[PDB]
Write a protein that binds this DNA or RNA. Sequence first.
RNA 1: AGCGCCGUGACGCAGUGGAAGCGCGCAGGGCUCAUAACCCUGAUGUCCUCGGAUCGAAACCGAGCGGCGCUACCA
RNA 2: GUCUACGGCCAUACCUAGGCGAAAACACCAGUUCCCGUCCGAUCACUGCAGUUAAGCGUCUGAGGGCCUCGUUAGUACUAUGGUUGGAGACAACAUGGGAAUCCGGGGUGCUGUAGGCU
RNA 3: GAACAGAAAUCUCGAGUAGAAUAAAAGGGUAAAAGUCCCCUUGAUUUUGAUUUUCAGUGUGAAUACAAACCAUGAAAGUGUG
RNA 4: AUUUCCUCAACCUAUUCUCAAACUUUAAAUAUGUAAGACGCCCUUGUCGCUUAAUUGGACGUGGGCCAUCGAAUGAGAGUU
RNA 5: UGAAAGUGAAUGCAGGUGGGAACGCCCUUGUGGCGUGCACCAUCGACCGACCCGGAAUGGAAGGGUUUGAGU
Lengths: 59, 287, 167, 191, 159
Amino acid sequence: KSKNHTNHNQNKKAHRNGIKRPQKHRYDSLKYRDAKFRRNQKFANRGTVEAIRQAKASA
Amino acid sequence: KSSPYFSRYQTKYRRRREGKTDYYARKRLIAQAKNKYNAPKYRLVVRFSNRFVTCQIVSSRVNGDYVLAHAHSSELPRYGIKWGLANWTAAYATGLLVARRALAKVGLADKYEGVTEPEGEFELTEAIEDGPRPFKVFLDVGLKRTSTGSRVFGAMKGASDGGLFIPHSPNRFPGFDIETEELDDETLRKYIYGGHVAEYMEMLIDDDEERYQKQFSGLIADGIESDQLEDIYAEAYAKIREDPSFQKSGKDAAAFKAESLKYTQRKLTAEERKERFNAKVIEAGRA
Amino acid sequence: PMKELRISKLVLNISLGESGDRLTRAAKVLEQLSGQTPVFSKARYTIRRFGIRRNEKIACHVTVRGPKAEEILERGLKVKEYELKKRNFSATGNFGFGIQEHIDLGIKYDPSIGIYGMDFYVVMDRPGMRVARRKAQRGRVGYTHKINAEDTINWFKQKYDAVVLGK
Amino acid sequence: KNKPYPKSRYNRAVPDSKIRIFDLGRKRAGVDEFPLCIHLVSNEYEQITSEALEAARICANKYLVKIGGKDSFHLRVRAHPFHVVRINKMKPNGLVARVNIGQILMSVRTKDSSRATAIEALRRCQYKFPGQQRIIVSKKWGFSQYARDEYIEKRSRGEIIPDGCYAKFLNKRGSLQEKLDLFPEASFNLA
Amino acid sequence: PHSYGIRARTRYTFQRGFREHGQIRLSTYLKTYKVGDIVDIKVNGAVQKGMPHKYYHGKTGVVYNVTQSSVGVLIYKVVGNRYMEKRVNVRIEHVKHSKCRQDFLDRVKANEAKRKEAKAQGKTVQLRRQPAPPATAHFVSTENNEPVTLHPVAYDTTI
RNA sequence: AGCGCCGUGACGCAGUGGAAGCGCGCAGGGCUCAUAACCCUGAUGUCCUCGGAUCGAAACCGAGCGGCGCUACCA
RNA sequence: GUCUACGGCCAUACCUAGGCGAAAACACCAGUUCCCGUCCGAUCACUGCAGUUAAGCGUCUGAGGGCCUCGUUAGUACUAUGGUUGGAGACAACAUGGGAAUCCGGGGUGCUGUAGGCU
RNA sequence: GAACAGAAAUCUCGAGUAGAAUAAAAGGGUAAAAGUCCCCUUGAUUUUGAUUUUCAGUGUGAAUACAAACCAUGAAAGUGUG
RNA sequence: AUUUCCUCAACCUAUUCUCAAACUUUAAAUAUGUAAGACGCCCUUGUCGCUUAAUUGGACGUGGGCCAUCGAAUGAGAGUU
RNA sequence: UGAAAGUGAAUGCAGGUGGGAACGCCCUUGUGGCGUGCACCAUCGACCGACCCGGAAUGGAAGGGUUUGAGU
């Protein structure tokens, strides 16, 4: 008879290589954020980079 | 009314049981978008008693409500609006007074002027072309029905003409006559300056004599139609705009501190309760 | 003080029977008797035996609140001979009386136009009932501030001086 | 071993139960009367059937009616069949009662002079039940949760008033006026 | 005969508490959430819009996105031999702050205060936590506390 | 063995919750002489028994007995 | 100190029967011209203080119904782990740990800001 | 309680934590509403990405929170992408 | 005889015996999510077309101060193709 | 790159941020501070094609976008 579902060995198979955690990254993609927030942050970061570069050049 | 019924009974909120707060409308009144973070939503709370009108501007926090500015109709006598402290001009004046107080508190007093000379026109507080936006307050009416002329809009109109930006439409103004969807400026100005009271005066001068004497008391002893109504309403509008500040009087605790606790029914203690129980048992004499 | 019982409302339902095809004529009868729109009533569920019409105006009830409330009560009590049973007085403080073939009521009469029948029901509560009927802060009227059958008996003795039939 | 399977809106067609009467004898006795109680407790988990319950009830009643009279016992059946046992046809089949540890099956309250025959009635009816059972001379006064010495001590003061088979007792709650009007002989000491 | 509906087997999970139905307290709409906050997900049955799945009920995550009426929570769920990132848009009615974050903040503030005091007075730091230490010797006295000798009780039925 | 139906005047056939129908049989009075045919009628039904939901049951729902009938195939 | 105007927690706040409430506020209340809406100015919007604490409201009194809290119940029930433990089994004891509920009894019957008024 | 004449037909006053209703199975939720009534409307509209469930994190179905327009309804806060 | 009688039913009160996988006010044990600073803590400042009545706030930053139990125990080299 | 007609990849050190091999300089022996930073990953941008726009006979140049490509 078919339909022989069981979970006896599934936990052991999962823990053979362990439950791997995903790699943690410092920066996450902004495609998950609000469109207006990302659009404004683009200009805010652009101005921040420009100001920092100007500070390095002038000083 | 059984014991299990009492046990399973769930009481409403305290203010809902008191019939004071509409929580369904309050939730939408104070609910800031989470992406605006701690920007407070300000409500122009307008309430009417049988004699007085209270207008205030409130911001809601987690632990309770906070009042930014307040203006009660029992202050206009200092400006010249004694008698009829719950009329349309009373609501208009206290809305104008609270608008000026809030603008002074936020600093937009000498910069954001509204309508210094009201003329019954539907005018939203426009923003400065290059400057700060006007203070935005949302009208709160409580449980009063929003009929065409319920006087919550009259207080809102006074607050808006005081300089505050209250988003509104002329739908619920005294004279609107919803057939062509057009505001009646003459009726609006008449209600702003108390002309409805004047028309009541004209109709009652000679129609029942005794009714005109018994109704509209108090002011019958001092004033008459067309002598001060439009005039003193305009003058007190100017007086409010000239000096809208609020002051604390010298009526402190003093003797009233000791003349108040005497009439309070105090609670007995456990020992007194036991003594009363024993005394009642002895008085019954069945033990 | 101000705990005096006076008339509050008096609903005039149709006592002669059902409106039926005479619905319009009954409506004018109530209109001429009260001076108000008869506000046609509504049917809740169709009766499989009485043969009523679903969602059709089968009754009309009005009120005569004001000085004319006393006048209409006087006219109703005139045909009723100023005699009501004790059970006519409800425990909540309201009393009603229904009439059939009111010869003493001032309604026109000719070959078919003539006598009708309206059952009156009177509710009386003067003080502090706004605190229970208002949209604002609402409360429950106090127990001592309530109208009982005995109070209605005494008020009907005082006003409309008559005798209650103690059956 | 199965989960309880009672009659409900999901199990409607169930054969009728067998025991209809659960109290036999002088049901309308008094608290002052019958100062002795005998219980037939179960020392193990069982699945007593309604057939056995009614058979033992009949045997106990027919034994009791001719040893002390019909007006001397208040035999009560403390087990009710609430579990439906299903059987594939040769799908409810029968009704049984599930009995836990120390659960009473039959209870008899009599006088101190009828203790021997009260024990004997349950001893004879022990053979009609599957499994093992025990007979216990209850320390309580009849069906009252109080003990005999405690009940008589409180009755001397007057805190207990009989009402039919059971009685009503003084409790430390309720209106004082109603308590006084309902307990006249009770001496409410001020303490 | 398993069914894979969204709210399957949620008969008691989404139930309101006993004598806790009806109006929802308005302090939830006044709570402030920022990106990086640690929040708990507790589904409210009265609010059906923005309802997260039953798996995320009782789960603690990190806020990553903030919208007008809801918030984005990052959760890690087991899908076999690895964790998977789940971004759940949950209305603030089902979101509450984790009190562990406030306890952590208080611990950090206390540590900073002790460190500042130690630097000022030239003393030791002694800031790390310790497990339950072994009991130190005490001086249990006997005056007015004479020991009571106990014996096992005999078997006596109370029925 | 299961499943399905039914149990109604002495007899038989119908019988839908506001409540027992018809015919046969029995018995008389009338034409005629009496029965056959009649005319006039009359009476007779614990609704198989028991219990329950329903304001109320023959009917709705259950337990029992009797009468039966249908499933009753591949090695 | 009392009270008024406006919120949070959402019954130690609800429900019920009685004792009080100086001032003020609130309330009932005095009429339907206007704005407005109904069969009906009772709800609904207005000009008003001639009246009232009588109702609402506040507070107090019930060996009150409920609700909140603490103990008994009780370390009882139950349960994680162990034995080549007992028992035919059902189940039970023991060992290393965790640990209720109902009932009963004792106590209690709301706390909480800003701006202002009252011999 | 009222005539009625069993009928609470209809019309009333009180008690009434929801024991009603919410199209259709069941469960959850809902009381100045999510129920009943009234008014106005077509957010049952166009488009893009992100996310949840079943999942291999493929598809299909269903759903969630946003964004760019045009709107509806409200006095407004707001709500509406069936 | 819209006058009375008890059993005939029915309703209310206080009780009383015994149950629920598709009942529940409560409510474990076991199991389970998150966190245990270095991507950490405070002052001075820069960006934005987002947001706010408002340099108001959100986010990204920058320069200085806090680097001695670097913040529970134990153990361990880890991860990606 | 688009189905195709067609069009066709530098604002900058061929960009910014975080980790990061190797090297160098200071500490002063600490699991060290500073300066660059290959490879690789994550991320914010820029450019090319397609799509959707404003729309400033034939042409789509500056201006854009919540997108899209197996691109620079």
